[PDB]
Design a protein around this motif. Structure first.
Motif, PDB file in Angstrom:
ATOM      1  N   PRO A 180       7.674  10.034  -4.437  1.00  0.00           N
ATOM      2  CA  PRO A 180       6.521   9.133  -4.746  1.00  0.00           C
ATOM      3  C   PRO A 180       6.929   7.950  -5.632  1.00  0.00           C
ATOM      4  O   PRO A 180       7.911   8.011  -6.346  1.00  0.00           O
ATOM      5  N   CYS A 181       6.184   6.877  -5.599  1.00  0.00           N
ATOM      6  CA  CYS A 181       6.536   5.703  -6.446  1.00  0.00           C
ATOM      7  C   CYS A 181       6.140   5.993  -7.897  1.00  0.00           C
ATOM      8  O   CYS A 181       5.299   6.827  -8.165  1.00  0.00           O
ATOM      9  N   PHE A 182       6.751   5.322  -8.834  1.00  0.00           N
ATOM     10  CA  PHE A 182       6.423   5.571 -10.268  1.00  0.00           C
ATOM     11  C   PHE A 182       4.915   5.426 -10.495  1.00  0.00           C
ATOM     12  O   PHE A 182       4.304   6.222 -11.178  1.00  0.00           O
ATOM     13  N   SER A 183       4.310   4.415  -9.933  1.00  0.00           N
ATOM     14  CA  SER A 183       2.844   4.230 -10.129  1.00  0.00           C
ATOM     15  C   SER A 183       2.099   5.469  -9.628  1.00  0.00           C
ATOM     16  O   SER A 183       1.112   5.887 -10.200  1.00  0.00           O
ATOM     17  N   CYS A 184       2.562   6.059  -8.560  1.00  0.00           N
ATOM     18  CA  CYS A 184       1.879   7.269  -8.019  1.00  0.00           C
ATOM     19  C   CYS A 184       2.043   8.442  -8.991  1.00  0.00           C
ATOM     20  O   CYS A 184       1.147   9.240  -9.175  1.00  0.00           O
ATOM     21  N   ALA A 185       3.191   8.564  -9.598  1.00  0.00           N
ATOM     22  CA  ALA A 185       3.423   9.699 -10.540  1.00  0.00           C
ATOM     23  C   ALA A 185       2.372   9.695 -11.649  1.00  0.00           C
ATOM     24  O   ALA A 185       1.807  10.718 -11.984  1.00  0.00           O
ATOM     25  N   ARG A 235       0.869  -1.213   0.000  1.00  0.00           N
ATOM     26  CA  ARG A 235       0.000   0.000   0.000  1.00  0.00           C
ATOM     27  C   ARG A 235       0.895   1.250   0.000  1.00  0.00           C
ATOM     28  O   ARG A 235       1.798   1.349   0.800  1.00  0.00           O
ATOM     29  N   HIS A 236       0.675   2.208  -0.871  1.00  0.00           N
ATOM     30  CA  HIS A 236       1.561   3.415  -0.847  1.00  0.00           C
ATOM     31  C   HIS A 236       0.884   4.524  -0.045  1.00  0.00           C
ATOM     32  O   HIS A 236      -0.300   4.766  -0.177  1.00  0.00           O
ATOM     33  N   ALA A 237       1.627   5.207   0.777  1.00  0.00           N
ATOM     34  CA  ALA A 237       1.032   6.309   1.578  1.00  0.00           C
ATOM     35  C   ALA A 237       0.544   7.410   0.632  1.00  0.00           C
ATOM     36  O   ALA A 237      -0.549   7.923   0.766  1.00  0.00           O
ATOM     37  N   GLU A 238       1.357   7.777  -0.320  1.00  0.00           N
ATOM     38  CA  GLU A 238       0.962   8.845  -1.282  1.00  0.00           C
ATOM     39  C   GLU A 238      -0.230   8.378  -2.129  1.00  0.00           C
ATOM     40  O   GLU A 238      -1.136   9.133  -2.415  1.00  0.00           O
ATOM     41  N   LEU A 239      -0.224   7.138  -2.534  1.00  0.00           N
ATOM     42  CA  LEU A 239      -1.342   6.603  -3.371  1.00  0.00           C
ATOM     43  C   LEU A 239      -2.649   6.621  -2.575  1.00  0.00           C
ATOM     44  O   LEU A 239      -3.707   6.900  -3.106  1.00  0.00           O
ATOM     45  N   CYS A 240      -2.587   6.312  -1.310  1.00  0.00           N
ATOM     46  CA  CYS A 240      -3.827   6.293  -0.481  1.00  0.00           C
ATOM     47  C   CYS A 240      -4.471   7.677  -0.457  1.00  0.00           C
ATOM     48  O   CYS A 240      -5.677   7.812  -0.524  1.00  0.00           O
TER      49      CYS A 240
END
Ligand SMILES: [Zn+2]
Length: 188
Positions: free
Chosen positions: A91-96, A60-65
């Motif tokens: 941020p993770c690539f998926s979040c970008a 689970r990504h904190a930024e994605l949440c």
């Protein structure tokens, strides 16, 4: 909220023990063209660790949440919304990809993310940072002055005053230099 709750997460400087810890703090505000309403009285936190109840972390990504939290509040498109997120990491690539497309689906919300330190997850990804600055919402380095504001809102300084120093800000100046290069390449 504990007086040092914000300092504890930011005092993670020593966390460099071979463990990965993520702390994200965000606030939500409701703004109406006739008047502005500040829901700062309430606040919440997000973690990049998956729920322990299901067993081992699943991912689970904190930024994605946080990005998924906005659509969960069913915000009104006709009403203005101001949301700010305080995080100190890249941020993770998926979040970008989600951060850029997210605003495209909701440009009526003012989203600002402050990163105390920015580390490139991979090389050749400099383009992602440039796009992230354009569509990845507004991103700036957190200054000690900005930290003071979070200190009063996230923690009840009543009886517990925070003493800020211009030490972390000095490092931000050097970091701004590298980040300035990304913004400096802002092609007209
Ligand atoms: Zn992510």
């Amino acid at each position: 909220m504990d007086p040092p709750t914000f300092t504890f997460n930011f005092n993670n400087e020593p966390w460099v023990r071979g463990r990965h810890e993520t702390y994200l703090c965000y606030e939500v505000e409701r703004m109406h063209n006739d008047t502005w309403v500040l829901l700062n009285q309430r606040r919440g936190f997000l973690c990049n660790q998956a729920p322990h109840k299901h067993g081992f972390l699943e991912g689970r990504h904190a930024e994605l949440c946080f990005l998924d939290v906005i659509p969960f509040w069913k915000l009104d498109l006709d009403q203005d919304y101001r949301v700010t997120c305080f995080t100190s990491w890249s941020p993770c690539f998926s979040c970008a990809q989600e951060m850029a497309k997210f605003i495209s689906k909701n440009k009526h919300v003012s989203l600002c993310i402050f990163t105390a330190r920015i580390y490139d997850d991979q090389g050749r990804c400099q383009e992602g940072l440039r796009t992230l600055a354009e569509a990845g919402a507004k991103i700036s380095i957190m200054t000690y002055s900005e930290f003071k504001h979070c200190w009063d809102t996230f923690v009840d300084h009543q009886g517990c005053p925070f003493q800020p120093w211009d030490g972390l800000d000095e490092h931000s100046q050097d970091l701004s230099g590298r980040l300035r290069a990304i913004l400096q390449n802002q092609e007209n």
